């Protein structure tokens, strides 16, 4: 139960500002015994290093964000911050916080551990949001393939990315394929999530997709029946 958790994502217009928070918890050490990085990963790219801080002094910034991003840290609240100003279309990325024990003051190098956060999405564009419509993909009795049936749900017409899809509140994970999103000719995203199950449990066991789209605040639980479809 060591943890780093980002917050502050969103859709921000060009030449505006945004602030990202990374909350630090768990460990065997005092707060302030870590160096902290911000890293960003753009859509379909590698990892870009953004900036660093440790005890509130050792700082530094990539020329991409230099004189535009200010990293700061509060050691009393266990909080790492990135204030970003004058945003551009080329800052659009998943931002990760990550912690280093190489550059900590107490220098306990033998017992080294990294740790990275879960990532927070910053999109720089003209703003908007749209929630998905969620539709069952129904299993057919004629589509019984060797005792296996497939069922799913289609998550359609949303913006921006991402949606998260779970099955039966996380109780069904085996055989689950959640597809990458496709950008439709409408300019909106769509994806399908599917799962393969025993055909014998159709109409006797309940299957529910759980779809979350954070930018619209849409949470949708969808029952999938054994409708041939």
């Amino acid at each position: 139960x060591x943890x780093x958790x980002x917050x502050x994502x969103x859709x921000x217009x060009x030449x505006x500002x945004x602030x990202x928070x990374x909350x630090x918890x768990x460990x065997x050490x005092x707060x302030x015994x870590x160096x902290x990085x911000x890293x960003x990963x753009x859509x379909x790219x590698x990892x870009x290093x953004x900036x660093x801080x440790x005890x509130x002094x050792x700082x530094x910034x990539x020329x991409x964000x230099x004189x535009x991003x200010x990293x700061x840290x509060x050691x009393x609240x266990x909080x790492x911050x990135x204030x970003x100003x004058x945003x551009x279309x080329x800052x659009x990325x998943x931002x990760x916080x990550x912690x280093x024990x190489x550059x900590x003051x107490x220098x306990x190098x033998x017992x080294x551990x990294x740790x990275x956060x879960x990532x927070x999405x910053x999109x720089x564009x003209x703003x908007x949001x749209x929630x998905x419509x969620x539709x069952x993909x129904x299993x057919x009795x004629x589509x019984x393939x060797x005792x296996x049936x497939x069922x799913x749900x289609x998550x359609x017409x949303x913006x921006x990315x991402x949606x998260x899809x779970x099955x039966x509140x996380x109780x069904x994970x085996x055989x689950x394929x959640x597809x990458x999103x496709x950008x439709x000719x409408x300019x909106x995203x769509x994806x399908x999530x599917x799962x393969x199950x025993x055909x014998x449990x159709x109409x006797x066991x309940x299957x529910x997709x759980x779809x979350x789209x954070x930018x619209x605040x849409x949470x949708x639980x969808x029952x999938x029946x054994x409708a041939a479809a």
Binding site: X57, X58, X60, X103, X105, X107
Partner: protein, 86 residues
């Protein structure tokens, strides 16, 4: 060349800086950053100014090859240069 005006203190740690982005070659007797090709670094491990590498690889301008020069260990760079007073 030495320049211990660089090695200030970061209120508990010994703090190196740089002239203009020049190449400062740095580590201390303790274990910390071992080369030093950087902007202004700090020093996690050591504290004393008197046990650190305040160096200036600032080879934007060559020199005369005085006997009272420390070698630039990397290479025999160019800079063949005349004598006026033949």
């Amino acid at each position: 060349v030495a320049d211990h005006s660089l090695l200030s203190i970061h209120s508990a740690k010994v703090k190196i800086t740089v002239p203009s982005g020049a190449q400062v070659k740095y580590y201390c007797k303790c274990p910390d950053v071992r080369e030093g090709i950087t902007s202004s670094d700090h020093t996690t491990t050591c504290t004393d100014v008197k046990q650190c590498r305040a160096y200036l690889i600032d080879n934007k301008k060559w020199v005369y090859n005085s006997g009272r020069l420390p070698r630039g260990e990397g290479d025999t760079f160019k800079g063949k240069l005349h004598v006026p007073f033949v």
